[PDB]
């Protein structure tokens, strides 16, 4: 549908070198020019921050922070690019405008399908070996709360979790496990709250 | 109500591999990447194509400039080469494993650089090139990369699995084992 | 180079 805007690469100028390390080994060296242009939406397009980050091999050397309005060197390796690009006033004007011409432009497109995306979690509870496992899988977005309850009272100790696990295919999963020694008749409840759920999902397990 | 999101355009060019990458990231997940060779937009989920488009030749121009910028950085720094970052490798199922129920094994390669790996799936000790998929090099918050390799499988108690990852930071290609336990 | 449209 609607075409996305993008950050167009800026040309670096050579001529100056720094005194000596980094980058691979002697028998197998490598060289990496790496750039991440980050549009930060703190509350949609109401508050937007642009953070461009330049990496050479393993070292972040240059940044452009829209709250600064100019390029700033993170290490000495990035200072020539900062001095070169900050001497270009039209570049700086164009860069500062990209919170609108790129960031807010692309958000309105992604607001149609990426922002409202919701996948309902699948909740399963099974014992092991003890350890009560609450499996919450195949949900989106990542914002989720998984609580263990024993006799309706929230258990805040003995929790062993994998944390939020990113599957890489726009789904999440997690395992929240409770170390309990269960007395007869005890009711264990795993409660899950998620933006895809109008009401909390509850799965019970009785000892 | 509040909408908190981070959209990242990540790109690199790597020598001596002469390989470039251009991708968009949304809250830690790939939206798309541009096939630099074929100049086409590859959406992470097919349904994304209905809502957005990208002129892929813009990425090819970026990589050409990044290619020339890399030569500038190579002239600027002359540091002793001595650092590769070995990866974290985790093997796990996409869903709870039930016998006879099709599932997906995830080989999660994390916290590594440079962005070059060689990954082999092993079912019962022999490579499997069928029912496998793979992502491009995904960005992290820091300077390192992560990557997903997937293997569709049918859970059984007779089979075992290994994801073998080779990387320049590894003295020896490491394989992470996986087998079904009820 | 890249042959761009138009």
């Amino acid at each position: 549908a609607d075409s996305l805007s993008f950050f167009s690469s800026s040309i670096k100028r050579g001529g100056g070198s720094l005194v000596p390390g980094s980058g691979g080994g002697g028998s197998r060296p490598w060289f990496l020019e790496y750039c991440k242009s980050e549009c930060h939406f703190y509350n949609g397009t109401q508050r937007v921050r642009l953070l461009v980050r330049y990496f050479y091999n393993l070292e972040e050397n240059l940044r452009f922070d829209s709250d600064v309005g100019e390029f700033r060197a993170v290490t000495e390796l990035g200072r020539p690019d900062a001095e070169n690009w900050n001497s270009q006033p039209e570049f700086l004007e164009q860069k500062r405008a990209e919170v609108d011409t790129v960031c807010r432009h692309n958000y309105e497109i992604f607001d149609n399908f990426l922002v409202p995306r919701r996948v309902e979690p699948t909740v399963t509870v099974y014992p092991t070996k003890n350890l009560l496992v609450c499996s919450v899988s195949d949900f989106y977005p990542g914002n989720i709360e998984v609580r263990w309850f024993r006799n309706g009272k929230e258990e805040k100790t003995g929790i062993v979790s994998t944390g939020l696990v990113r599957n890489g295919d726009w789904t999440f999963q997690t395992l929240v496990m409770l170390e309990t020694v269960p007395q007869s008749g005890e009711v264990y409840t795993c409660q899950v709250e998620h933006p895809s759920l109008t009401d909390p999902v509850t799965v019970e397990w009785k000892a | 109500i509040k909408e908190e999101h981070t959209i990242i355009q990540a790109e690199f060019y790597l020598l001596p591999d002469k390989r470039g990458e251009f991708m968009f990231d949304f809250d830690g997940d790939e939206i798309f990447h541009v096939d630099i060779e074929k100049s086409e937009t590859i959406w992470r989920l097919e349904e994304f194509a209905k809502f957005a488009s990208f002129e892929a030749q813009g990425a090819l121009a970026n990589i050409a400039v990044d290619k020339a910028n890399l030569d500038v950085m190579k002239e600027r720094s002359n540091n002793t080469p001595d650092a590769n970052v070995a990866p974290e490798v985790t093997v796990l199922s996409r869903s709870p494993v039930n016998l006879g129920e099709p599932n997906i094994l995830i080989c999660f390669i994390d916290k590594f650089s440079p962005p070059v790996v060689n990954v082999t799936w092993l079912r019962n000790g022999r490579p499997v090139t069928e029912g496998v998929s793979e992502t491009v090099f995904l960005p992290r918050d820091d300077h390192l990369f992560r990557k997903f390799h997937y293997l569709t499988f049918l859970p059984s108690t007779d089979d075992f699995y290994d994801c073998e990852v080779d990387h320049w930071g590894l003295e020896e290609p490491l394989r992470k084992h996986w087998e079904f336990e009820e | 180079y890249v042959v761009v449209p138009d």
Partner: T-cell receptor, first 116, second 109 residues
Framework: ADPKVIQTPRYLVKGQGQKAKMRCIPE?????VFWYQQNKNNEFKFLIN????????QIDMTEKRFSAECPSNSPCSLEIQSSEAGDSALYLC????????????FGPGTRLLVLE | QVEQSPSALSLHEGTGSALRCNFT?????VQWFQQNSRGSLINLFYLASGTKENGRLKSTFNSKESYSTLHIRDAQLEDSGTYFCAALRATGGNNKLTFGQGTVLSVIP
């Protein structure tokens, strides 16, 4: 202090099938060069752009009918291999300090006319 | 092509008027040119946002509303020529300037 782009010749007349070569000297220090085609209807058609000596983008007509160069020891050049009456236009050369981040400064252009 | 108006403009010496360019998509920035009788494009403005003033000229660019204007005041004979806006498509993979139709300005002596 204004950047200046040089272009020769100012005018050019050629017959159909002849080569029509036009030269451009970008502003000293500008690594990016553009070539546009402006006809009598004030329509501007992008032809090709350079990063130093390397072509980055060009349309199909330029690649198949034109020969473009921006060597380091010589002015930039744009040459039509077999001129056609439809090639009659003002050929503009522009240079810029950066790839897409700064002003494109244009030269006086070459007024090319291709007759039968 | 960018929509530009007016297509022609006759201005008495010492008076003012304004040109405008409408964009159908988000532009990174916009340049304004004055192509004189010699046919050479004279750079007037580079705008990524806001308003700039150059002598008797003045220009504004609004990226969200996708338009740019050029104001001429105290018109002089040397202001004659064909005025063009030109912008970079922020969504365009082709790195090129997209030109407006142009305004043919004549300064009445």
């Amino acid at each position: 202090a204004d950047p200046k782009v040089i272009q020769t010749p100012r005018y050019l007349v050629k017959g159909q099938g002849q080569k029509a070569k036009m030269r451009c000297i970008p502003e000293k220090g500008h690594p990016v060069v553009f070539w546009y085609q402006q006809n009598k209807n004030n329509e501007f058609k992008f032809l090709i752009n350079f990063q130093n000596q390397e072509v980055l983008q060009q349309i199909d007509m330029t690649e198949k009918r034109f020969s473009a160069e921006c060597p380091s020891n010589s002015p930039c050049s744009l040459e039509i291999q077999s001129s056609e009456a439809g090639d009659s236009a003002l050929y503009l050369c522009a240079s810029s300090l950066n790839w897409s981040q700064d002003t494109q400064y244009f030269g006086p252009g070459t007024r090319l006319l291709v007759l039968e | 092509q960018v929509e530009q108006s007016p297509s022609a403009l006759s201005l008495h010496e010492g008076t003012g008027s304004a040109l405008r360019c409408n964009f159908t998509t988000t532009m990174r920035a916009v340049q304004w040119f004055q192509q004189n009788s010699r046919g050479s494009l004279i750079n007037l403005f580079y705008l990524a946002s806001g308003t700039k003033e150059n002598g008797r000229l003045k220009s504004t660019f609004n990226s969200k509303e996708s338009y740019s204007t050029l104001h001429i005041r105290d018109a002089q004979l040397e202001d004659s020529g064909t005025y063009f806006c030109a912008a970079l498509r922020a969504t365009g993979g082709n790195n090129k300037l997209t030109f407006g139709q142009g305004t043919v300005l004549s300064v009445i002596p």
